[PDB]
Amino acid sequence: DVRLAKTLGLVLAVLLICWFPVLALMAHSLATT
DSSP, X not given: OOSSSSHXXXXXXXXXXXXXXXXXXXXXXXXXX
């Protein structure tokens, strides 16, 4: 990270799959089921 190597790393690893707009899409664009 710029702080350490985990807080943003987690945010990055999480945002990469949780960011903000792709979730509403993910629930339909990715279409789990």
